[PDB]
Amino acid sequence: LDIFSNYQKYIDNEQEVRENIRIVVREIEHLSKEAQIKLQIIHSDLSQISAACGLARKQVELCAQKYQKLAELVPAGQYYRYSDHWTFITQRLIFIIALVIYLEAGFLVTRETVAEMLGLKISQSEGFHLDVEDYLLGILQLASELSRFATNSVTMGDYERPLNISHFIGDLNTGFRLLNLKRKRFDALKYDVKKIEEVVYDV
């Protein structure tokens, strides 16, 4: 126990900081959920498609504040020592945002934009940044969502959306085609493309 006291202290510290970041993370998740259910209402009725966006946005801001918080929770490097939690959640948020901006205008946000919105810095030299993989997976979820959506636009009577969406997803997809394997998500989208093209042909 001569030196093991120091190590018990150190590790109790690290696990502490972990189950202390977990707090902030849950706190983000909840907001995310709020927005998420709202976009479910864009799935139910097209009128709310706008007010809903507004709402989701005012959730995104708060999330940004609490990301300032987590950014404060990560020491020196270590960013990847505590990576995971906020990877799944920020995949959620990158999604939310990309979806929202597509609902607004006919394109997908950039890494940069999503970053500025979440009060996050872009490059890894800034301590707490918005990693790329995260971004990509987020927009992949975007692609998955727009399918169910177009389907539900013809559902409630809209022979217009599915085309824009089919282009968007078309060239986005080809966008992933030039990416490499090291990865099942890229294939999944490879399929949602098929679903939308199908709903378009139905016109």
């Binding site: 998420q36 259910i37 479910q40 169910r148 389907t151 539900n152 559902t155």
Partner: protein
């Protein structure tokens, strides 16, 4: 020592109570399964009133499986027995309409409190996912009536994605069923 003569007994009591309770859970789960089966018939609408009455007798058998109560220690058997009931019942309601749909497990614990009670918390929010399944069933029965099922499932979903995630297993499969449905209400309108 001669201590264990009281231990083995002391817990054997539990073995027994658990077994008999599992009996009542089998009887309730199947006895209810038959009720939703009845609600699968679509004809006329006698099945609705006869079914609601039958459920009201299952409040008597539930009255039985709570009779011997004086905690979660035994809630293990609360399986299908308590779950199936919530499904069939809530189905009675969310096809009874034609939007809460409708019960609310507190009102249920209120009709169970008349048993003088069987606690009814998260088992409820589960039984109601099972009820999503059920709605899917009412719809698949069709083929102008699937649409109701679609709206219903979109609301349910929005209300099941709306919480904290266990249940991920239920909510995922529920999303899949809502995709089934949405795809049908979509294919209708050619």
């Amino acid at each position: 020592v001669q201590q264990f003569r009281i231990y083995s007994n002391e817990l054997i009591m539990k073995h027994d109570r658990h077994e008999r309770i599992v009996k009542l859970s089998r009887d309730i789960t199947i006895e209810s399964k038959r009720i939703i089966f009845l609600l699968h018939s679509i004809n006329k609408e006698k099945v609705l009133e006869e079914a609601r009455q039958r459920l009201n007798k299952l409040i008597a058998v539930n009255f039985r499986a709570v009779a011997l109560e004086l905690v979660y220690q035994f809630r293990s058997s609360y399986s299908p027995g308590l779950q199936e009931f919530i499904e069939a019942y809530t189905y009675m309601e969310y096809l009874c309409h034609e939007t809460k749909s409708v019960s609310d497990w507190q009102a249920i614990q209120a009709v169970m409190q008349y048993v003088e009670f069987f606690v009814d918390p998260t088992e409820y929010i589960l039984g109601l996912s099972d009820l999503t399944g059920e709605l899917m069933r009412r719809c698949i029965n069709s083929l102008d009536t699937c649409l109701d099922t679609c709206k219903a499932l979109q609301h349910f979903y929005s209300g099941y994605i709306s919480l904290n995630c266990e249940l991920w297993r239920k909510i995922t499969t529920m999303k899949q069923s809502v995709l089934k449905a949405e795809n049908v209400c979509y294919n209708v309108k050619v």
